[PDB]
Each structure stands twice: as structure tokens, then as C-alpha cells.
Write a protein that binds this ligand. Structure first.
Ligand SMILES: [Ca+2]
Ligand SMILES: [Ca+2]
Ligand SMILES: [Ca+2]
Ligand SMILES: [Ca+2]
Ligand SMILES: [Ca+2]
Ligand SMILES: [Ca+2]
Ligand SMILES: [Ca+2]
Lengths: 48, 113, 311
């Protein structure tokens, strides 16, 4: 982290590579989810 | 649970889930061997009256004595109070048990113990 | 072997109420009427190769005519096995019918029988037959309170089933005949579908065979039979089967409870059923053999039943 820079792309200072997909219009940002292991191991409770 | 900076030190199953009211998470974290985890859980549960003092929980871990109604007993005595042979819990001879190994697998149902 | 010395079958029961065709007990038209020998007969002599325990083997087609499958009328559930003694009387284990501690108390109208079945889970319409029980007789000497002594139950079918290749009664040995066969050193045969293992054991890992299964078991010594159990054993029950050496448990819990224990008699080319496959220590305890209930002495008793129906 000490000395690591990456230029902004959007107007609102959010870094992210603008991939060429039907053009440079779209940004590829994925979402990932996580829940408690132990606490939600044996059981299920829809593992919210 | 207490001594907040415990989660950075290495831990002791006996310095977390014995000498202290613990999370089954730290229990789960420290145990992983989920079979013995269930065993330790069964312990905790039965030892719900053996939470204190420490040596009481140690004995409840030994398991030679039945706690309360006898949910925790894990000895080798397989004889009735009057010397009658104990029937196999899982087997249907001579009675088909509605309450048997399938219904109570967590009690470690031995041969006829 | 019997050559020019034919031991004829002596009719001890009157055909009027015991049923016709009594002279043709245990004679399969496919095997006996053409002198065809099954592939499993070469093991009959107890002088076989060092008495090593033989695993379970699938029986042929039509070689088990005296086997009966006692089924629950409602709902669908296999209950037990049984032996075919005559075209209008059937023999089954008493514990399969009455066991108040087992929550099992069946009347005559709550169980049925199936004769000539090949596969349990299938239905082969033409060759197999079904029957519904009407009258049940229980011997007063059946003692289930101490050692399951004399596990005897008699059943009568309302609609008779005629003779066929897959359905044929087995012969009944007497006292002298049983003594002669047992002192000859011939192995016994037990037929079933593994329902005994399901009923009396919780051993999961060997699924219940839906195919007709046969096991050959010889006899052992009677005093050793007494020493092989912590529970008293009457003379009406005897040991049979190989001794299961340490490291493995024997196959004494194969087949169906209440089924036959038959031996092919070398003196008349007939199959004699020594008794009933009753509960034994071979199921519940490792290191034990099959315990079978003797019914050979009951000849005088048998007529005593049909003397009630001589009207
Ligand atoms: Ca965790
Ligand atoms: Ca702590
Ligand atoms: Ca803690
Ligand atoms: Ca501390
Ligand atoms: Ca932790
Ligand atoms: Ca910890
Ligand atoms: Ca300590």
C-alpha cells in the first residue's frame, strides 16, 4: 500500500478499468458475497 | 471470550471453551474435527450444569458420570440395575425401539452400554 | 448312494383334509421329473474341501418351490418367510404373527402369502401365485417368553393353489428319518430374501436381496451348541452352520425368518425340511450360527389339526 497510485477514470473519482465491450461505454465491476463460516457451517438458515 | 486481544494470540481449547464461557465459533475454530466438535458440544450442553467450576467441566469431559438424567454418560456399563442384559439399542430384538440409534445418534450409542 | 434300494414315501396323513398330491412332496417337474441336478448339489457331502465357509450364491429358477413369502396385507411391507407343507396348509413362524411386546398382533385377515416368487420387487404374473390367509392355529407349546421355543404357526388357505413347477410342497421327515439323515452328514439348505436380517438386525451395508437366495449350512455338535449361547436351548431347537472364525461373522442371518431348512435325502431322491428357520444368535451376536426350530416330531400333532375340519 505504501506508494501505490492509480488514476481515476469516471468523473466521481472511482477507479476502474473501462473495458472495450461494444465500446468503452461499460465498466466491469463484479459483486461477491460472504457469510460466517463456523456460525453458518453445520446449520443453514438460508445462510444469509 | 473476555480479554479481547485473545483472538491474536494462539489459543487453548481449555483457555477459551473451558475456563471461560465460549463461542461455539471459537469452539468450531479450535475443533474443526466436527465429530468431536459435536462431542464437545454435547459436552457443553450436558455440562450446562458443569460450566463451573473448572475441574467439574474437566470431569464432565471425562464423561464417566451421568449428568442429571444421564445424557452425557460415556462409560462401559451395559447392565440393567438388576443384572438383566441390555438389548442392542439399534437392533429390534426383542423390541423395536421407537427411540433408538436413528433418533439419538448424538449420544454415542455403543453395543449395549 | 441309493441304487436298487428305493425308500418309498409312507403317507402318514389322510389326503382328505391334509390335501391331495401328498405322495409328490418336493418333486420339481423341471428337475426331479427329468433327473436334472442343480449346480449347487456338488457340496452336499460334509466331506467337502476343509469346510471353508462358502459365500452366498444366487439360486436357480424353479429350485425353491416350498418357499413362501409372508407379506403384510396393508400397507405394503414384507414380513417374513414360511414353508409350504401341503397344497392347503402352510407353516410359518409364530413370532411373525403374534408378538405383543413388538406391537405385533396379527389376525387371520391381516397378512397374505406369496408362493413361487422369483424377484421380490417385481411381479411375474404367470408363474407365481398369491393367497390370502383364513385360519391360523398356534401350538400351545410355543414359548416366546424364555427362548422362542417351538416357533410354530399353521395357516390355511381359503382358495387352494394347484401344483406347479415353482410351487410344490416339501416332504416332512419323521423321527427315524431325521436321525438317519442327520447321522449321514448332509448339509442343510436355507432359502430366503434377507428379510430375517432386516427384521432382527440393524446391520446396514448389505442390502436386502430381492433375488431368491440360498445358503448351505451343515450341523454342529449339540453340547457345543449349548455352550455357544448364554440362553437355554431346548431340544426342539438345534444349531446349524459353519463356525464363524474370529475376524468375520457368519452368514447365518441370511434369508427370511420362518423359512425352510431343507436337505436333499439321498435315500429317496427327495427334499426333507428339518424344521423352521427361527431366530437365533447368528443374527444379533457375532460368532454364532443359525438356530432352527424342529418340527419333525409333530406328525401325530399334524392330523390333530385337520381332525377339527373333518366335516
Ligand atoms: Ca470462524
Ligand atoms: Ca477469552
Ligand atoms: Ca474469546
Ligand atoms: Ca484470560
Ligand atoms: Ca478466532
Ligand atoms: Ca481463540
Ligand atoms: Ca488453564
Amino acid at each position: 500500500c505504501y506508494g501505490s497510485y492509480a488514476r481515476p477514470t469516471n468523473s466521481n473519482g472511482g477507479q476502474g478499468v473501462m473495458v472495450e465491450q461494444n465500446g468503452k461505454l461499460e465498466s466491469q465491476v463484479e459483486m461477491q458475497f460472504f457469510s460466517t463460516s463456523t456460525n453458518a457451517t453445520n446449520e443453514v438458515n438460508n445462510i444469509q | 471470550a473476555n480479554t479481547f486481544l485473545e483472538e491474536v494470540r494462539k489459543g487453548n481449547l481449555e483457555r477459551e471453551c473451558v475456563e471461560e464461557t465460549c463461542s461455539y465459533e471459537e469452539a468450531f475454530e479450535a475443533l474443526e474435527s466436527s465429530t468431536a466438535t459435536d462431542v464437545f458440544w454435547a459436552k457443553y450442553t450436558a455440562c450446562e450444569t458443569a460450566r463451573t467450576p473448572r475441574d467439574k467441566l474437566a470431569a464432565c469431559l471425562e464423561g464417566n458420570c451421568a449428568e442429571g438424567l444421564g445424557t452425557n454418560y460415556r462409560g462401559h456399563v451395559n447392565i440393567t440395575r438388576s443384572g438383566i442384559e441390555c438389548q442392542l439399542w439399534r437392533s429390534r430384538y426383542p423390541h423395536k425401539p421407537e427411540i433408538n440409534s436413528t433418533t439419538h445418534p448424538g449420544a454415542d450409542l455403543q453395543e449395549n452400554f | 448312494e441309493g441304487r436298487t434300494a428305493t425308500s418309498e414315501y409312507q403317507t402318514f396323513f389322510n389326503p382328505r383334509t391334509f390335501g391331495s398330491g401328498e405322495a409328490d412332496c418336493g418333486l420339481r417337474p423341471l428337475f426331479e421329473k427329468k433327473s436334472l441336478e442343480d449346480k449347487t448339489e456338488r457340496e452336499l457331502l460334509e466331506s467337502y474341501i476343509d469346510g471353508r465357509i462358502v459365500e452366498g450364491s444366487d439360486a436357480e429358477i424353479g429350485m425353491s418351490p416350498w418357499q413362501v413369502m409372508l407379506f403384510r396385507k396393508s400397507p405394503q411391507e414384507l414380513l417374513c418367510g414360511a414353508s409350504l407343507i401341503s397344497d392347503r396348509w402352510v407353516l410359518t413362524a409364530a413370532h411373525c404373527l403374534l408378538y405383543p411386546p413388538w406391537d405385533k398382533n396379527f389376525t387371520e385377515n391381516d397378512l397374505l402369502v406369496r408362493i413361487g416368487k422369483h424377484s421380490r420387487t417385481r411381479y411375474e404374473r404367470n408363474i407365481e401365485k398369491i393367497s390370502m390367509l383364513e385360519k391360523i392355529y398356534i401350538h400351545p407349546r410355543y414359548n416366546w417368553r424364555e427362548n422362542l421355543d417351538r416357533d410354530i404357526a399353521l395357516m390355511k388357505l381359503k382358495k387352494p393353489v394347484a401344483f406347479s413347477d415353482y410351487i410344490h410342497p416339501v416332504c416332512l421327515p419323521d423321527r427315524e428319518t431325521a436321525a438317519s439323515l442327520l447321522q449321514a452328514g448332509y448339509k442343510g439348505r436355507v432359502t430366503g430374501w434377507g428379510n430375517l436380517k432386516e427384521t432382527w438386525t440393524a446391520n446396514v451395508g448389505k442390502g436386502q436381496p430381492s433375488v431368491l437366495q440360498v445358503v448351505n449350512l451343515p450341523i454342529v455338535e449339540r453340547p457345543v451348541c449349548k455352550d455357544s449361547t448364554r440362553i437355554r436351548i431346548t431340544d426342539n431347537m438345534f444349531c446349524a452352520g459353519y463356525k464363524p472364525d474370529e475376524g468375520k461373522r457368519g452368514d447365518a442371518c441370511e434369508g427370511d425368518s420362518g423359512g425352510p431348512f431343507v436337505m436333499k435325502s439321498p435315500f429317496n431322491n427327495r427334499w426333507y425340511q428339518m424344521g423352521i428357520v427361527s431366530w437365533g444368535e447368528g443374527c444379533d451376536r457375532d460368532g454364532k450360527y443359525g438356530f432352527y426350530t424342529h418340527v419333525f416330531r409333530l406328525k401325530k400333532w399334524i392330523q390333530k389339526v385337520i381332525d377339527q375340519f373333518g366335516e
